[PDB]
Structure 1
Amino acid sequence: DKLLLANWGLPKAVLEKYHSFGVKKMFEWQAECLLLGQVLEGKNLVYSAPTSAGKTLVAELLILKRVLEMRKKALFILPFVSVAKEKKYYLQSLFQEVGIKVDGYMGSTSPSRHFSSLDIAVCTIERANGLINRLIEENKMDLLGMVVVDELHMLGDSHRGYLLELLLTKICYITRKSASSNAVQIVGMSATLPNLELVASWLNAELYHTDFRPVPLLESVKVGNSIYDSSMKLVREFEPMLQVKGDEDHVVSLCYETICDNHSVLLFCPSKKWCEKLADIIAREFYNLHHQACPPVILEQKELLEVMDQLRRLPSGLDSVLQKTVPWGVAFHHAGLTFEERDIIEGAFRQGLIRVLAATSTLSSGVNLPARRVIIRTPIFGGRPLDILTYKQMVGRAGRKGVDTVGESILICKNSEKSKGIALLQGSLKPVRSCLQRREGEEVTGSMIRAILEIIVGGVASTSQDMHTYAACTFLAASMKEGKQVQLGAIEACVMWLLENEFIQSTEAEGKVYHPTHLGSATLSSSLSPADTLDIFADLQRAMKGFVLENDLHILYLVTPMFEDWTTIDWYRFFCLWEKLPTSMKRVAELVGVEEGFLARCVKGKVVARTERQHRQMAIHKRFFTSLVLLDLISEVPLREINQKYGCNRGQIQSLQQSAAVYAGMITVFSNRLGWHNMELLLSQFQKRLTFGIQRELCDLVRVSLLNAQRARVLYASGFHTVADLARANIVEVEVILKNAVPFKSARKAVDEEEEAVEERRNMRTIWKGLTEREAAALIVEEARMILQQDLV
């Protein structure tokens, strides 16, 4: 009964919470992983097990042990905000009865407390690195007592997760420089990489690996009728029941085959367009079955009506394809949907009301959504062969906790190029290699630059000897010394780059000693990338030369998120959208460096930049086009009009809203630390406006009149009007309120002013077909009184 969790010294509350939330006994692999000789003595640990096992239970027990016994702050680092929230509630629900002050840093969420009062901080990678920089800047690094790290195999990505090398390297360096019984214990989960012994020995960790699964997975590939296992054993020839030309690979039959068993099918797709198309086809066959009408389909239509009606509450309305599919238990789930459509369709699949769910990779990662069967539609995604890590992560969802006894998965392929499928079933992950590693013919990399930047700006390792001592702690150094048995000259080409771009200063004494500029501290405090800072700071300088206070577009530009290919841009539509801009906004285009000749060149084709002019002219226009969308969001333009106007979609929009609201807070901290306090107040005073939710005190008014919420607010800020009060107000009183609600804009033409600049000031005061307040104050009374005449009935 060594596996019975009650023996392990858990507090009874947590034991019963595990009895509530989970299972009473650990798996045997978990009992081994906790009992590597020094792990319970505080040795660092790296381990790997399938995600269907109780992967985090080992870490959670190690978290609780250290925080009960050593009573020091712990940091839990997770790859995504959604996982960070899900795990925060789990950890709170598990530990709160013990009083462990769990909170976390993720998205816009913050503890609303100073860190030194928490016990567990749950973080995304971005905010875990940011917090450690501030612990180093505050020199409070002594507070941190543990770090826990999921998906430690992310070290090899240029986009994200290299921060996880820098983060652990900073911890190791400060510890090693102090040490040369652990100050910080590191626990890492790494999904069974090869050369995982290298990651373990780099961290001085114990290593545990198992392939144990609560349920087995039959990975297989389909070509033609033939079904092969991982060994290429032909196990079945498939029958294309419900044979139709509607799918030449008979995807419907593999789904229907499992629908006939009353089990749930998960179906990964190359694209949102293909995913949307494929869910329509499947639903039409369940329509075709039921309207022509072997096992029948069970539809549970009483619940599908509740789900499909609940989706009607959402501001954008129910998707015109979900209207076709959801009545049959067919849905699609991808990041082209809004954030709530995702949450509702996830919950409806977790309970099995939806039984077929077509999806992109958004169900591979970020949400744990297990299924009984996983179908993967092609080995090629876009123009490229599927990442074998994505393949493993997709098929890893085929297991369930006893809801079936096995998992199954099917790669679908054609008979040509079949080996490019089998290469996934027989392959394995590439060895992980740190992004710090230069190519022999190449300049230093942006992650090495940022690694070197952070230490200096925090005042750690200001000497080049200390920079070489830091670099010896990297996973690159551990990887190099293993593989070889040049980095000393890669530091120099970074420090020069940090000098030539003014992030650091050199001071004499024998040698040189380096310090942050304000452009250093600003880059670090905003936790921007240096490569992005040279675009943001170049935009900020050109505003100091002439900031248009007349309107929001110029300051939206400065706070507009930096994205690469946030959409495809139709440069001809952008050219038209710029050409028709109002005068006081076309003046913003000229001042930010948008140019007729560049848009025309981008209409006439496409450009790949070859000069520092061309490399930033793109970065100007791409940022400006993104601001034109943000301008329409704060102007409350309907999203259905934005999508048609810009080619955007309602998922891209909602992520833009969430990103802009954070950029305004970074670039306030950026300008605050460049000392540009006249720009900080303009940005901080605008951070208060760059938000998009309904002010609930107004809600019962905007519920009815569909007026712009500022009109509702002034009709609330004056006289506290409900709709039943607006029906009583005098049309002349409302006209005076509507006239004196706005910030002033004179109607006259000034001397030496173009009338095309005056017309905008008089137009901005109009309320709609050109309703002046004289007229609008009547129509608003007519609307209010005619509605009230139909609401008290």
Structure 2
Amino acid sequence: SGSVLSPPPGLGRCLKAAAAGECKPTVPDYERDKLLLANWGLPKAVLEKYHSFGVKKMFEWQAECLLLGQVLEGKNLVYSAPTSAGKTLVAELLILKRVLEMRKKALFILPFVSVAKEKKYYLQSLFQEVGIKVDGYMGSTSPSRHFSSLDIAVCTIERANGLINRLIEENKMDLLGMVVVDELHMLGDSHRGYLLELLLTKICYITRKSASSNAVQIVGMSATLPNLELVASWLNAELYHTDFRPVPLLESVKVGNSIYDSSMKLVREFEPMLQVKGDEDHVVSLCYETICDNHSVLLFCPSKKWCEKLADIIAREFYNLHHQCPPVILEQKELLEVMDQLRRLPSGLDSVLQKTVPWGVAFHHAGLTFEERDIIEGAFRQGLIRVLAATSTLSSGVNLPARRVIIRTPIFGGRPLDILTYKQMVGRAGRKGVDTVGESILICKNSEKSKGIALLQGSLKPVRSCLQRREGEEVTGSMIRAILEIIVGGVASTSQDMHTYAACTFLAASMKESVQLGAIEACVMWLLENEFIQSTEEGKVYHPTHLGSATLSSSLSPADTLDIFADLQRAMKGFVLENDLHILYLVTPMFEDWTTIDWYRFFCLWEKLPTSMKRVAELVGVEEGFLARCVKGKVVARTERQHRQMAIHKRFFTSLVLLDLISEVPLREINQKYGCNRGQIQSLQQSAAVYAGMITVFSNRLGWHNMELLLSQFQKRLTFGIQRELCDLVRVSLLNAQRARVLYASGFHTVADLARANIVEVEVILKNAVNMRTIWVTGRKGLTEREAAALIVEEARMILQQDLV
């Protein structure tokens, strides 16, 4: 309570001295024992959890990052360091400081749901011994515990931005003590990366209006940015940057037999150990060298098709070596369990995976289901899979290290590889505390030799403001939403409050000319003309409408909201209730293409389509004539924006897919019927699950109760992909769509019935879906059919009791 963490005395002195000197002391003149983690007054429960696996001492840069400046006093901090250097620890120690000393709540923000889920359990494991409640706000997932009874909320960008807005309407902004942002370089330009700016600017604006002692501390972290100092000034934060890295990493490119360093100085020549009797660029040979040293290798490939092709080739030579240098020495018993977990899945065991996985080889792309990739990542992380051929999708995903990383080509998707993508790939080489080094090899040809060097000698592009206006397009989505949030939320009323806000943006930090100040005024006008905001005339004062407050509470983009609002009023004038199709059309997202739709397949399902669903189609805009003009001819046309008709048919097509999906139609059947892979479907439902929740809230705030009533059941049905009967069962964590079904078909319709269940009977029911651990969960200890059965019944009782998580 008094002091949860305090640094060793005079450690700040020495480090401040060394930093102020022209050159660093050959021997650091401070007790090397002072960077021992136990001397910082850390509570015992956390000190052991850190010492649980490594984490005994701090780095030179970690001590300087805390001690140099007023970081520990409450000052905002923005620091950058290479990956796997212990960037997590700096933030963890700061969160633990403020939460226990100032008794306020912290916010941890991560880019993706998968890394957010990983972080939730990772933060739960460290802080549960000190009574620190850690839950998560991810995608469609909602915390069981109220926000008032939490300490650390782990969120994605969208959910965090929404959570901030909730706290403004309830005036409980005082609860929030600090916000931690991982990967701050995604601030510049992204599909959702811009929301991170709106979030931070909103915090900087509120704390500035109270400036007219500590407030809300912001701890941001990222990769080496050229304009990182520009970001620190924007957030009024102290800056820190280091290149320190516990495992030195070598980036190298390979031409012919020769392998080269960044400087182009040849570092090693290369002679393949084995001969793949295939014109190869020694690709199999490079992987083989790594495996023999009892390690694992990540192989990144441009297309989804190369990964499967390459995993098959690698597996084939592994086959040849076994029946004829040394062999791959894999673990067969543990590999069979992996295949069995794959076998017992809603997707089944992929044919290419069936060949390669037995020989410690696998691939990873967006074509696979989220359940297959969770298995492969876990298998690779354990060492069961030694070779993993992935795409650029994995490079930005979860934490998954390997000894050697190989990039097949600097040309991804017919275009040169982005610099940020390259740095994310080569960044996964080197496990802190296990491997001595992380090696990165970029395989190239003679024509593309100059382009390969460009990547090793490359740096991140400067961070854009993402609210820029390029001449004619004076208005922009990101700005409109940002302006809407501050007016509707009630933190900006007058015209004077508006110009105060313009100062807090990252955009005005970029000038330190004020031509963008007039753009703010344009968004306000846009909001007035479209009934989002009201104006009452020492300047005119504004206020939110019902449509304004509804749009904000729904987390919808104002540009999209206009069309959503019209579509809903039209549906409530004439609505089809005999099926679920018309409801689904309203919650079908069409802001991005989720697949390349085959129109001929579409037209065949159209004739065969029942009358009840054709009525919904006609009622929407689906013309049979346009479907015919799609099959005969591939004319996108799109000459006239009045060709949204294209979007309508794409939307109705998508709505058909979601209909079979919540009707518990197998993913393989849906694939044959429509012509899209299981990866695109799963990506679609999680997109539609989120959108369905938005439309429900939007309908609730407008008073459209009847429409809301129908919609308020589909966020859950889209998430798990179930029918109404299974809605009660899926409340259990361990129960997905398939397990919920076999339990329903056996007599367990509700949670109440599931608490009364006999354990040995559940195991038997499980046996029908086929000490062997054969059942996968999320964050799974590879449950046995016995362990899983006992956990489900115990949990069903816990949910019925509503005791704790």
CA gap of 1:119–1:659, structure 2 versus 1, over 3 A, is same
Alignment RMSD, CA only? 8.5
CA gap of 1:520–1:610, structure 2 versus 1, over 3 A, is farther
- CA offset at residue 26 of structure 1? 0.8
1:766 aligns with 2:794: no
| Corresponding position of 1:447 | 478
CA gap of 1:352–1:604, structure 2 versus 1, over 3 A, is same
8 Å contact from structure 1 (residues 349, 355) kept in 2? yes
CA distance in 1, matches of 2:142, 2:301: 35
CA distance in 1, matches of 2:661, 2:690: 15
Secondary structure of residue in 1 paired with 2:79? strand
1:20-49 deviation digits (Å, cap 9, x = unpaired): 133211111111111122101110000011
- CA offset at residue 486 of structure 1? 0.8
CA distance in 2, matches of 1:256, 1:776: 38
CA distance in 2, matches of 1:775, 1:10: 36
1:542-561 deviation digits (Å, cap 9, x = unpaired): 31231111211110111123
1:174-194 deviation digits (Å, cap 9, x = unpaired): 110111222000000021111
How does the TM-score come out when normalised to structure 2?
A: 0.84
1:218-251 deviation digits (Å, cap 9, x = unpaired): 1011122221111111223322444446453231
CA gap of 1:764–1:522, structure 2 versus 1, over 3 A, is farther
1:638 aligns with 2:666: yes
Secondary structure of residue in 2 paired with 1:690? helix
CA distance in 1, matches of 2:496, 2:380: 57
8 Å contact from structure 1 (residues 535, 619) kept in 2? no
1:158-213 deviation digits (Å, cap 9, x = unpaired): 41121111111111101101112220000000211111110011111111111111
Percentage of pairs with the same residue: 100
- CA offset at residue 362 of structure 1? 3.2
Q: Which runs of 4+ in 1 moved over 6 A?
A: 693-740, 763-793
1:595-648 deviation digits (Å, cap 9, x = unpaired): 234333433444557577535323322221111111111223222121122122
CA gap of 1:776–1:471, structure 2 versus 1, over 3 A, is closer
Task: Select 2:489's aligned residue among 434, 458, 472.
Answer: 458
8 Å contact from structure 2 (residues 110, 155) kept in 1? yes
- CA offset at residue 465 of structure 1? 2.7
Say which is worse superposed, 464-473 or 317-326, in terms of deviation. 464-473
8 Å contact from structure 1 (residues 36, 206) kept in 2? no
Task: Select 1:335's aligned residue among 363, 366, 371.
Answer: 366
Task: Select 1:657's aligned residue among 685, 688, 694.
Answer: 685
CA gap of 1:169–1:779, structure 2 versus 1, over 3 A, is closer
| Corresponding position of 2:383 | 352
1:653-706 deviation digits (Å, cap 9, x = unpaired): 223333333333221111111221221112225556556467999999999999
CA distance in 2, matches of 1:266, 1:462: 54
Secondary structure of residue in 2 paired with 1:371? coil
CA distance in 2, matches of 1:57, 1:330: 33
1:429-454 deviation digits (Å, cap 9, x = unpaired): 11111101112343322111111111
Secondary structure of residue in 2 paired with 1:574? helix
Say which is worse superposed, 160-169 or 473-482, in terms of deviation. 473-482
- CA offset at residue 770 of structure 1? 42
| Corresponding position of 1:207 | 239
Say which is worse superposed, 185-194 or 152-161, in terms of deviation. 152-161
Say which is worse superposed, 679-688 or 252-261, in terms of deviation. 679-688
8 Å contact from structure 1 (residues 46, 189) kept in 2? yes
CA distance in 2, matches of 1:790, 1:678: 30
For residues 746-785 of structure 1, what are the structure 2 equivalents within 5 Å? Answer: none
8 Å contact from structure 1 (residues 542, 591) kept in 2? no
- CA offset at residue 364 of structure 1? 1.2
Secondary structure of residue in 1 paired with 2:499? helix
CA distance in 2, matches of 1:181, 1:107: 35
Say which is worse superposed, 2-11 or 574-583, in terms of deviation. 574-583
8 Å contact from structure 2 (residues 720, 736) kept in 1? no
8 Å contact from structure 2 (residues 337, 772) kept in 1? no
8 Å contact from structure 1 (residues 78, 150) kept in 2? yes
8 Å contact from structure 1 (residues 246, 281) kept in 2? no
CA gap of 1:739–1:47, structure 2 versus 1, over 3 A, is closer
8 Å contact from structure 1 (residues 575, 599) kept in 2? yes
1:313-356 deviation digits (Å, cap 9, x = unpaired): 21221111111101111111222212221122112111211110
Where structure 1 has 5 or more consecutive residues not aligned to the other structure, the ranges are: 741-762
CA gap of 1:369–1:689, structure 2 versus 1, over 3 A, is closer
- CA offset at residue 83 of structure 1? 1.6
Say which is worse superposed, 690-699 or 238-247, in terms of deviation. 690-699
8 Å contact from structure 2 (residues 79, 221) kept in 1? yes
Secondary structure of residue in 1 paired with 2:78? strand
Say which is worse superposed, 694-703 or 364-373, in terms of deviation. 694-703
CA distance in 1, matches of 2:580, 2:550: 24
8 Å contact from structure 1 (residues 539, 592) kept in 2? no
CA distance in 2, matches of 1:314, 1:395: 32
CA gap of 1:494–1:606, structure 2 versus 1, over 3 A, is farther
Secondary structure of residue in 2 paired with 1:207? strand
Secondary structure of residue in 2 paired with 1:129? helix
For residues 476-625 of structure 1, what are the structure 2 equivalents within 5 Å? Answer: 476-481=507-512, 486-508=515-537, 511-606=539-634, 613-614=641-642, 616-625=644-653
CA gap of 1:707–1:640, structure 2 versus 1, over 3 A, is farther
Computing the radius of gyration from Cα coordinates, the structure with the larger value is 1
Say which is worse superposed, 561-570 or 172-181, in terms of deviation. 561-570
1:122-168 deviation digits (Å, cap 9, x = unpaired): 11111111000011111211211111111111111241121111111
Task: Select 1:222's aligned residue among 254, 262, 266.
Answer: 254
8 Å contact from structure 1 (residues 266, 371) kept in 2? yes
CA distance in 1, matches of 2:447, 2:665: 50
Say which is worse superposed, 210-219 or 457-466, in terms of deviation. 457-466
CA gap of 1:765–1:501, structure 2 versus 1, over 3 A, is farther
8 Å contact from structure 1 (residues 705, 784) kept in 2? no
8 Å contact from structure 2 (residues 252, 262) kept in 1? yes
8 Å contact from structure 2 (residues 318, 327) kept in 1? no
Secondary structure of residue in 2 paired with 1:478? coil
Where structure 2 has 5 or more consecutive residues not aligned to the other structure, the ranges are: 1-32
CA gap of 1:789–1:186, structure 2 versus 1, over 3 A, is closer
CA gap of 1:726–1:347, structure 2 versus 1, over 3 A, is closer
1:244-292 deviation digits (Å, cap 9, x = unpaired): 4645323111111212222211001112211111101111111122233
CA gap of 1:674–1:615, structure 2 versus 1, over 3 A, is farther
| Corresponding position of 1:259 | 291
CA gap of 1:764–1:336, structure 2 versus 1, over 3 A, is closer
CA gap of 1:502–1:782, structure 2 versus 1, over 3 A, is closer
CA distance in 2, matches of 1:135, 1:705: 28
Provide the aligned length of Structure 1 versus Structure 2. 767
CA distance in 2, matches of 1:525, 1:670: 7
8 Å contact from structure 2 (residues 686, 718) kept in 1? no
CA gap of 1:770–1:620, structure 2 versus 1, over 3 A, is farther
